[PDB]
C-alpha cells in the first residue's frame, strides 16, 4: 500500500482480533492482552459503506429496448441495431473494469493509511516515553500496568507523569 | 522495568482475490460480488403486469384470430411470447411487422372500439374454414373481408372521422388471390385497388396474384397495413376489391410497456427486472444474465464476476 | 520559558456540499458548478448565420410553396423551424420525407440553377386554387406540372447531363389522381408511369387513383421524390403521364449546416451554443438545457447540479 | 483524508485565517501571532487550477446531429434512434458523476497532504529542540522571540544555536 | 567523529513528457506509447484468409459477371474491395444493395449449389453482346435469362423446397426493357411479373419499360432480389413475363468474415488488425490510423499521441 | 506529489545512480560511497509492469462492424451510422485521456511513496543513533564503517551495539 502499514512495517495481520480491524495487543507485567480500536475500525467501515453505497444508486430503469436478438438475416438496419447493442456492452463492461479496479486499489490504500493513521497517534500520545521498535510495537520505559495500557488505549494517558522514569531509563 | 504495545490489525485464513489498477490478482478479507450472473428461471408476476400470450403472438391477437380472442381488450407490461405460438386463420404477411409488433407492444393495450362503417354494395364477414370459429368458418375479429354483392362489386368510398383527443389505430389488408377466377369471382374486377389516407398521408396497394405456398388449405394470402389518425384528421377509405376492411380502431397509449419473448414460466413472486431468463435481483449495479431486461435493471456487462474489496489487505503471515 | 508553534489550515462559517466516492455530501470552502443549467431564452444571431423560417418549413421553401418565395436562394448555418408553419400550396406528400428535410439543411443552401429541359407535346406550367399565387391559380415555384397537348400526351423522355464538377439535386414528383375521370383528362393514359434514373440508379413510381380527404379543395395528392446526380453521370427522365417535372437542380454543398425546431426569438448577441431554448454558454463542460444542440456545446447530461471542489474540507469545529 | 492531518490530528480549521490556505500561530515570550504560508497555500491552489483547467480544457464541437424528438410514432428506426441517444446520455452522465466523485476524492487528499507536509517540514527545522505535543503543535524548549519564529517560518532556523539550551529543557 | 547517510533517488538528464489530472505537461524518467499511429502500408496476408477481389466487386463475383468467375465457390475471412473494380456484362441495380453486399461479405462464401428447376414453355440462356463470355454472347453464370418459345410465353409456376438444414440464399432478378417492342419480342405479354414466395414471405415486382441511361450498348437492365429460405420452407416462382431466374442457390454461413475498402497492397506477412490503410501491430491499446478495422485490433481514438509513464518524476536539479 | 519526498525534502534526484532507482549515499571514515536499494527499486517496476500488463489486456476483436465511410448522400439512415460512430470514438477517446491521467497521477504519487517508505524504514533501524537532517539524509552520532553502513542497507544494523556511543554524542 501507498503508507507502508499494512503489509509493511506491520509484518502480518492478525487472525485473533475478532472484535475490530484494528487494535492493540500489549505485554507487561501483568501478563498480555488485546484490545479493538473502535475509532480507527469504525472510520474504515464507514468508507467502505460509503463507496459500497454509492456503487448501487443509480443503475437502473429502462422500458423501450430496442430488440437484441434477429431469427432472420436482414442486413443494414439489423446490422446497425447489434453495433449499437455491441458497442453499448463494451463500453459498460469497460465502465465496470475500471471502476472496481479503482475502488478496490483506494480501498487497499485507505485501510493501509487507518492503521499507519492509528499508530502515528500512538506514537504522539506517548512522548518521550516510548520508543518505536520498527514493527509497529513500542518499547515503553516505565512500569505500565493495565490500567496505565487502557490509559494509553482510551485517550488519557498522561506522560508527564511518567516523563522522568522513562527519560531515566532510557538515557 | 517496561512493556510493550503493540499496533495491529486482523486477517483471516482465507480470503478472497480481487482486481485492482496494478494488479490481476490481490488477497483482501472480504469481498462483494458486483455482476448478477444467477436466475430463479421464472418471471414474476409482481409488481408488473405480465400477459402472458401462451399460443398466441401479440400480432394474432391484435387481428383476432379465432383461438387468440380471449386477449381482446387485454393491457400489459410485458407481452410474453412463446415459442409454442402458432398461427389459426387465414394465412398472412405483414411488411414491416417487426414495427407494428413494437408499436402495440408499446401502446401496452388492445382496447378496440367497434365503429359504424357502412359497405354499400358488397356483401360483408367473409369467412374461411381455413380460419373457424366454433365449428363453421370464420375470420378474424377485427377485420372484415368484403366481396360482391350479387354480381357487381362497386367502387367503395367511406370516411371515419377522428372528434376524440386520442390517437387512433386502423388495422386493414389487401386479399391476393391466387388465381384470375377467384380474383372476379370474389370482386368483380380484373384488378383491385386498396387507398387509406389521411390528411397528412397516404398508402394504395394494388394486390397480387399468383400461387404461394400452400398454408392451412391456401395458396392466397391477406397483407396486413395500418394507419393512424391523429385527432381532428380524417380517414378515407377508397377500394374497387380486395379490401379487408377495418371493423374499428385500436386505443394509442403511450408508457412503459414492451414485449420479450421467452419460454420461462410465470410465478407469483416480486421482482422489479425481467430477463428471458427469468426474474433476477437487482441489487447488484451489473447483471451477466441477459442483454434482454425490462424493468429497473443491473447494466449488462460481458464479465461473469467483478469482486469490489469490503475489507483491507489480507496478511494471515 | 518556551514557545508553542501551531500548525493550521482555514475554514469558513458554511462551505458547499459536494460529492466524492466515499460521500454523497461531504463539505468543502469552496466548489464551482459543471453543469450550465439556463438559457437567455433567445437564440443569438452570431457568429452563426440563423436563417428564421417564420411561417416556412425546408421542405415548403425547398419545393417553392407559394408564401416561401421569399426564401429562394436563401443559405444558413442554422434553419430554425417554427411550430406555427403552415403549408398553403398543392397538397403533398414525401416518402422518406425526414431524409430529404436532413439532407437539404446539411447542404445550406436553396440555391437553384434552372435548366433547359424541353417537354415535347404537353403543356407546361399547370397550376391550381390549392396553391394560390395572388389571386389567380398556380403552383410550386421549382415545379413543372405537366398536362395533355391538345388530345395527346406522349411518352416524355428527356435527359440532363452533369458537366459540372459538383453533385446535383433533382426534385421532382408524380401526380395521383382522384378518379379515373381526371386521369384521363389531364393525362390521355389510363395508368401513369414515371421513371427517372441515372446510370446506376433507378426509381419507378406508378401513380394511384382513388379519393383522399379534401385538403384546400383537393382529394388528390402529389408524391415527391428527389435524385442526386454526380459529376459524370446524367439524368433521364422517361414518363407516359403523370410526372411533375423539375426545372433545374439544387446546387449541393457539405458542411456544418443543420435544422431545429425552436419557436425561441432571434436576437442580436454572440453564442457558439444555440439548443431550442435558446443560447446558452459553452464554459462549463456539461449542460442541462437540452440534448437538441448545435454549435461547440457542453455536453448533456442528465444532472441538473455538479459541483467540483475547489477547496479543502471545511472543518470549522470539532 | 487519507494524510490524516485535516480534520484529523489537526481538531479543526481556523475562521480566523483569512490570508491563506495553510498557516501558523504562535505563543512566545513577547505574545501570540498568526501568519499564512505562502509556498502551501500557492501549491494547493496551483494543483486545484490544474485540475480544474483539465475538465473544461477540449470538450465541445458539434460534428453532424440526428433527430432527437419525434411527433409521430414509426416503428423500428425511431425506435433505434431513440435507443442510440438514451444510450450515450445515460453514458455521459455517468462519465460526469465519476468525473466529478474521483476529482473530488483528490481535491480533499491533496489538501490534506499539503497540511501533512508544511507539518513535517517545521518539525525537520526543529531537532531535538521541539517535540510534537500531538495536535499540530510543537513545544519548543528554549526562548524563541518573533525574530526566531519568524525564522522557523522563513525556513532559516539554525537548530544548533538553541540545541544546548533546549535539551537541558527538555532532559 | 560520525558519519551521514542519505536517501535518493535516481534522475536522468531529459525524461518524457506526460499528463496528468493535476497536470498538462509532468516530466517523468521514462514513459510508452499507447496509441499506434503508422502503418506498415500493406495488408498482411497471414493469419486471416484475405480474398483480393482486384477488378471484380463482391456482387459481380456473386452474380457471375464472366471476368469474375475466376472468384466461382471461393471463400474468405476478408474480402478486399478494389477502387479499380469495374462491372463488364449486363446493366443492373441492386435494390438495397448495400444489405446483399453486406450478408454475402458476413456469409463468408459464394459456395453455388446448382439445382434441377424445370422452366416449361420458354426459352433458356439468354445472352447479351453486352456480356461477352468468350468471343460469343453470354451472361451472369449464376442466373438464367428465360424468353419466349415459339410465340408464347407460359404462366411459370415452378417450385424448389429446402430439404437440408442450412439456410439457402436464391438470387433473381427482372429484366426492364427499353421500349415495348422489347417487352413483346421477349415475353409474349406486354407487361411482366415476377412473384418470388416462401410460407411466411412473398414479394412482387412489375417491370417498368422505358429508357435509362446508355450502357455498354444497353438502355435497359436488370434489378437483382434475393430471397432466403429456411430448412423446411420452399420457394415458389410465379411469372408470367420478365424473370431472370435462379440457377441454384448459395450456401449461408455465420462466422466472422467480412469485406473492406482498401487499395492497400497485399503482403506476405503476419498481423491480425488490417485497416484499410494496411495491418497494424495490436501491443498497443489505441489506435489512431483508420476506424474501419478487421481482426483483434487496438480502439480508435482521436488522439495521436498518449504516454502512459513508466518511471518517476524526473528531477535533475531542485 | 503526495507523499513529499520525491521532488519535497529530497532536493533532487541523482543522476549519478545508474544501477537503481532508489539508493544510498553515505559518507564515513573510510570515505564516500553509493548503492542502490533493490527491494525499492524492483517494488516500483513491479507496480508499474503490473498496471502496463493490465492496461494492455486483451484488446478488442470484432470481425463484422457497419460500414463508416460512405460514397453517396443517402439521409436518415446514414446519418445514424454516423452519429452511432462519432459518438462511440468520443466515448472512447474520452476512456483513453482519463485513463492515462489517472494512471499517470497514481504512478507519480506510488514512486513518491516508494521513496518515503525506505526513508522512514531507514530512520526505523536507527533507533537514538541518528537525527532526521530534514533533507533525506541520516546523520549517524558513532563510527560507522563500511561493513555497519552495509548492515544498515542489508537491514541487519544492531541499533544496541552503537546507543551508548551514539548517545553520549547526541546530548554531550
Ligand atoms: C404452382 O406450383 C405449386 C407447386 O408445384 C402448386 O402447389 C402445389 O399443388 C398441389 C396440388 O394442389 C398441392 O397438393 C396439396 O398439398 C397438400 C399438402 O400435402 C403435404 O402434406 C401432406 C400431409 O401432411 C403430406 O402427406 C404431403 O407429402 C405434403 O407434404 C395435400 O395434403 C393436398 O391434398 C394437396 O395434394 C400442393 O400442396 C401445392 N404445394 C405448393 C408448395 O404450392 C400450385 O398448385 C401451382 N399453381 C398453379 C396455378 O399451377
Ligand atoms: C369519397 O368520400 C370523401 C369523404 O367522405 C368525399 O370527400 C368529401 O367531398 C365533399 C364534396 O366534394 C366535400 O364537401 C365540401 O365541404 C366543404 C366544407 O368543408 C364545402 O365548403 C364544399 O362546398 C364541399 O361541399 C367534403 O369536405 C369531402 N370530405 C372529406 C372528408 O374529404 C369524396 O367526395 C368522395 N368521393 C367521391 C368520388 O364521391
Ligand atoms: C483500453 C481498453 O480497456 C479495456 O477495454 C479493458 C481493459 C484495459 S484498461 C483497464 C486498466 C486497468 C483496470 C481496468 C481496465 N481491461 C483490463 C478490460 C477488462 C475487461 Br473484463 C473488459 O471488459 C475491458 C473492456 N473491453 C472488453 C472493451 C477491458
Ligand atoms: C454502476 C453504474 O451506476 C451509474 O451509472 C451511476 C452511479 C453509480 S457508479 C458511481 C460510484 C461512485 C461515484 C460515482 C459513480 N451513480 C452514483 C450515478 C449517478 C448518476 Br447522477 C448517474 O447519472 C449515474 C448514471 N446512470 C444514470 C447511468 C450513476
Ligand atoms: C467532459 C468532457 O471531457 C472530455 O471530453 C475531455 C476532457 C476533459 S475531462 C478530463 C479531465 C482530466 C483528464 C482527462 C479528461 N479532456 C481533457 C479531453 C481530452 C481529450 Br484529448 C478528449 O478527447 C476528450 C474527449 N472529448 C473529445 C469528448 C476530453
Ligand atoms: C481510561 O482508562 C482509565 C484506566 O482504566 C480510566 O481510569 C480508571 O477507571 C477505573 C474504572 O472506571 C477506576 O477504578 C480508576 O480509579 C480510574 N483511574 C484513574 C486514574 O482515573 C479512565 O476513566 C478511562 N477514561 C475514559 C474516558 O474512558
Ligand atoms: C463482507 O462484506 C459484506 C458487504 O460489506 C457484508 O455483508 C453485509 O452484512 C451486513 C450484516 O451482516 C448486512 O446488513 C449488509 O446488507 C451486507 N451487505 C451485503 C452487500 O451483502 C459481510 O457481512 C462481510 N463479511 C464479513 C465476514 O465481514
Ligand atoms: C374495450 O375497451 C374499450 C375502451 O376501454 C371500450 O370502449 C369504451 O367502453 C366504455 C364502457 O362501455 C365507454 O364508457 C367508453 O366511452 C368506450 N370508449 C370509447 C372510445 O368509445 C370497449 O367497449 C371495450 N370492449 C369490450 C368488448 O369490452
Ligand atoms: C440466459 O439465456 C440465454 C439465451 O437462452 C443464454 O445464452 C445462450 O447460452 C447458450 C449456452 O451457453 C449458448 O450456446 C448461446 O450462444 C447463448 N445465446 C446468447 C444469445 O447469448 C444464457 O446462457 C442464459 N443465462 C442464464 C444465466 O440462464
Ligand atoms: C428546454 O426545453 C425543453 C423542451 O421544451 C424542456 O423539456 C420539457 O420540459 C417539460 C416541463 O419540464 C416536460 O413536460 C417535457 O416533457 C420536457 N421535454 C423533454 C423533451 O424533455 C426543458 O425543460 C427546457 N429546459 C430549460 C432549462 O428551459
Ligand atoms: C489512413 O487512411 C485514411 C483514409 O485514406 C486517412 O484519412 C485521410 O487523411 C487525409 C489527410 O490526413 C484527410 O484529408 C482525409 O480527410 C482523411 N480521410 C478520412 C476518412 O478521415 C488517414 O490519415 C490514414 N492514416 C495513416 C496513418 O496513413
Ligand atoms: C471558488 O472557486 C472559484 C474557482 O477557482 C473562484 O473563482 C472563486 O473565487 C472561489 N470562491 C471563493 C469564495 O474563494
Ligand atoms: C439563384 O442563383 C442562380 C445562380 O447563382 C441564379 O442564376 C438565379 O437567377 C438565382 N435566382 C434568384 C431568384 O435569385
Ligand atoms: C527570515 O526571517 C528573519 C527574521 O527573523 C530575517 O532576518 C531573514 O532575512 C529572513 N530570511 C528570508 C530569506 O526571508
Ligand atoms: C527537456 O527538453 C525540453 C525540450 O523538449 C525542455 O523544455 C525541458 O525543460 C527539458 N528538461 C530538463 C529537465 O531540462
Ligand atoms: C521505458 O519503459 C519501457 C516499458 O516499461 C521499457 O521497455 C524501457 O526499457 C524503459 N526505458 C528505460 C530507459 O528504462
Ligand atoms: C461449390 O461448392 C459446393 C459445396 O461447397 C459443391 O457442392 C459444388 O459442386 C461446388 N462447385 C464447384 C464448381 O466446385
Ligand atoms: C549484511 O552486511 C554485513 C556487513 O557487510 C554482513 O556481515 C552480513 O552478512 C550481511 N547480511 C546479509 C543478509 O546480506
Redesign the pocket.
Given at each position: 500500500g501507498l503508507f507502508g502499514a499494512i503489509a509493511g512495517f506491520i509484518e502480518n495481520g492478525w487472525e485473533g482480533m475478532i472484535d475490530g480491524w484494528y487494535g492493540f495487543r500489549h505485554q507487561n507485567s501483568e501478563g498480555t492482552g488485546q484490545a479493538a480500536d473502535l475509532k480507527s475500525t469504525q472510520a474504515a467501515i464507514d468508507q467502505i459503506n460509503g463507496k459500497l453505497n454509492r456503487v448501487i444508486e443509480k443503475t437502473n430503469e429502462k422500458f423501450h429496448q430496442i430488440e437484441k436478438?434477429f431469427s432472420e438475416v436482414e442486413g443494414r438496419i439489423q446490422d446497425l441495431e447489434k453495433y449499437v447493442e455491441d458497442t453499448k456492452i463494451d463500453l459498460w463492461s469497460y465502465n465496470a473494469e475500471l471502476l472496481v479496479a479503482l475502488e478496490n486499489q483506494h480501498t487497499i490504500d485507505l485501510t493501509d493509511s487507518e492503521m499507519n493513521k492509528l499508530f502515528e497517534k500512538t506514537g504522539r500520545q506517548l512522548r518521550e516515553n516510548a520508543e518505536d521498535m520498527g514493527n509497529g510495537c513500542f518499547k515503553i520505559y516505565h512500569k505500565c500496568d493495565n490500567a496505565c495500557i487502557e490509559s494509553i488505549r482510551n485517550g488519557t494517558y498522561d506522560h508527564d507523569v511518567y516523563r522522568d522514569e522513562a527519560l531515566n531509563n532510557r538515557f | 522495568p517496561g512493556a510493550t504495545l503493540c499496533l495491529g490489525h486482523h486477517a483471516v485464513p482465507n480470503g478472497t482475490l480481487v482486481k485492482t489498477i496494478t494488479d490481476d490478482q490481490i488477497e483482501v478479507t472480504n469481498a462483494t460480488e458486483l455482476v448478477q450472473?444467477?436466475?430463479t428461471?421464472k418471471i414474476c408476476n409482481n409488481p408488473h403486469r405480465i400477459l402472458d400470450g401462451i399460443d398466441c403472438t401479440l400480432i394474432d391477437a391484435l387481428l383476432g384470430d379465432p383461438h387468440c380472442d380471449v386477449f381482446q381488450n387485454e393491457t400489459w407490461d410485458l407481452f410474453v411470447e412463446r415459442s409454442k405460438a402458432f398461427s389459426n386463420c387465414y394465412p398472412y404477411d405483414v411488411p414491416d411487422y417487426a414495427s407494428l409488433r413494437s408499436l402495440v407492444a408499446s401502446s401496452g393495450t388492445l382496447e378496440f372500439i367497434t365503429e359504424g362503417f357502412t359497405w354499400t354494395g358488397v356483401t360483408q364477414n367473409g369467412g374461411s374454414n381455413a380460419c373457424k370459429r366454433g365449428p363453421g368458418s370464420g375470420f378474424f375479429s377485427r377485420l372484415n373481408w368484403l366481396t360482391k354483392s350479387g354480381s357487381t362489386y362497386p367502387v367503395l368510398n367511406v370516411t371515419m372521422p377522428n372528434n376524440d383527443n386520442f390517437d387512433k389505430l386502423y388495422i386493414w389488408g389487401v386479399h391476393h388471390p391466387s388465381t384470375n377466377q377467384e380474383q372476379t369471382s370474389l370482386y368483380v374486377q380484373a384488378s383491385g385497388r386498396v387507398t387509406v389516407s389521411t390528411r397528412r398521408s397516404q398508402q394504395t396497394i394494388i394486390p397480387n396474384i399468383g400461387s404461394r405456398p400452400w398454408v392451412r388449405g391456401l395458396s392466397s394470402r391477406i397483407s396486413i397495413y395500418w394507419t393512424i389518425v391523429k385527432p381532428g384528421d380524417v380517414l378515407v377509405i377508397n377500394s374497387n376489391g380486395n379490401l379487408i376492411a377495418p371493423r374499428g380502431y385500436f386505443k394509442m397509449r403511450t408508457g412503459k410497456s414492451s414485449i420479450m419473448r421467452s419460454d420461462a414460466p410465470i410465478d407469483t413472486c416480486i421482482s422489479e427486472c425481467i430477463?428471458?431468463?427469468?426474474s433476477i435481483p437487482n441489487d447488484k449495479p451489473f447483471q451477466?444474465?441477459?442483454?434482454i431486461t425490462y424493468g429497473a435493471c443491473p447494466k449488462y456487462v460481458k464479465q461473469n464476476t467483478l469482486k469490489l474489496a469490503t475489507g483491507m489487505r489480507n496478511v494471515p503471515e
Amino acid at each position: 500500500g501507498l503508507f507502508g502499514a499494512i503489509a509493511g512495517f506491520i509484518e502480518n495481520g492478525w487472525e485473533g482480533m475478532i472484535d475490530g480491524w484494528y487494535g492493540f495487543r500489549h505485554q507487561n507485567s501483568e501478563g498480555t492482552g488485546q484490545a479493538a480500536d473502535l475509532k480507527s475500525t469504525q472510520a474504515a467501515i464507514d468508507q467502505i459503506n460509503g463507496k459500497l453505497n454509492r456503487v448501487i444508486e443509480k443503475t437502473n430503469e429502462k422500458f423501450h429496448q430496442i430488440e437484441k436478438e434477429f431469427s432472420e438475416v436482414e442486413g443494414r438496419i439489423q446490422d446497425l441495431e447489434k453495433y449499437v447493442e455491441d458497442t453499448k456492452i463494451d463500453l459498460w463492461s469497460y465502465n465496470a473494469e475500471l471502476l472496481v479496479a479503482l475502488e478496490n486499489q483506494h480501498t487497499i490504500d485507505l485501510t493501509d493509511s487507518e492503521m499507519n493513521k492509528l499508530f502515528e497517534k500512538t506514537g504522539r500520545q506517548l512522548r518521550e516515553n516510548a520508543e518505536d521498535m520498527g514493527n509497529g510495537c513500542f518499547k515503553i520505559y516505565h512500569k505500565c500496568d493495565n490500567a496505565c495500557i487502557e490509559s494509553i488505549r482510551n485517550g488519557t494517558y498522561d506522560h508527564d507523569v511518567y516523563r522522568d522514569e522513562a527519560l531515566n531509563n532510557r538515557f | 522495568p517496561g512493556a510493550t504495545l503493540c499496533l495491529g490489525h486482523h486477517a483471516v485464513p482465507n480470503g478472497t482475490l480481487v482486481k485492482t489498477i496494478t494488479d490481476d490478482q490481490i488477497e483482501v478479507t472480504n469481498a462483494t460480488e458486483l455482476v448478477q450472473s444467477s436466475s430463479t428461471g421464472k418471471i414474476c408476476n409482481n409488481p408488473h403486469r405480465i400477459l402472458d400470450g401462451i399460443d398466441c403472438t401479440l400480432i394474432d391477437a391484435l387481428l383476432g384470430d379465432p383461438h387468440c380472442d380471449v386477449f381482446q381488450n387485454e393491457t400489459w407490461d410485458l407481452f410474453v411470447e412463446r415459442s409454442k405460438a402458432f398461427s389459426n386463420c387465414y394465412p398472412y404477411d405483414v411488411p414491416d411487422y417487426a414495427s407494428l409488433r413494437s408499436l402495440v407492444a408499446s401502446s401496452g393495450t388492445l382496447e378496440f372500439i367497434t365503429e359504424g362503417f357502412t359497405w354499400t354494395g358488397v356483401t360483408q364477414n367473409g369467412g374461411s374454414n381455413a380460419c373457424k370459429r366454433g365449428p363453421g368458418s370464420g375470420f378474424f375479429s377485427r377485420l372484415n373481408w368484403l366481396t360482391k354483392s350479387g354480381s357487381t362489386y362497386p367502387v367503395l368510398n367511406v370516411t371515419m372521422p377522428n372528434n376524440d383527443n386520442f390517437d387512433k389505430l386502423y388495422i386493414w389488408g389487401v386479399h391476393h388471390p391466387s388465381t384470375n377466377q377467384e380474383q372476379t369471382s370474389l370482386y368483380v374486377q380484373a384488378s383491385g385497388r386498396v387507398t387509406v389516407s389521411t390528411r397528412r398521408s397516404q398508402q394504395t396497394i394494388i394486390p397480387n396474384i399468383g400461387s404461394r405456398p400452400w398454408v392451412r388449405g391456401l395458396s392466397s394470402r391477406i397483407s396486413i397495413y395500418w394507419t393512424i389518425v391523429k385527432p381532428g384528421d380524417v380517414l378515407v377509405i377508397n377500394s374497387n376489391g380486395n379490401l379487408i376492411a377495418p371493423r374499428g380502431y385500436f386505443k394509442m397509449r403511450t408508457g412503459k410497456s414492451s414485449i420479450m419473448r421467452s419460454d420461462a414460466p410465470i410465478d407469483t413472486c416480486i421482482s422489479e427486472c425481467i430477463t428471458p431468463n427469468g426474474s433476477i435481483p437487482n441489487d447488484k449495479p451489473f447483471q451477466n444474465v441477459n442483454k434482454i431486461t425490462y424493468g429497473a435493471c443491473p447494466k449488462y456487462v460481458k464479465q461473469n464476476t467483478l469482486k469490489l474489496a469490503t475489507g483491507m489487505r489480507n496478511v494471515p503471515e
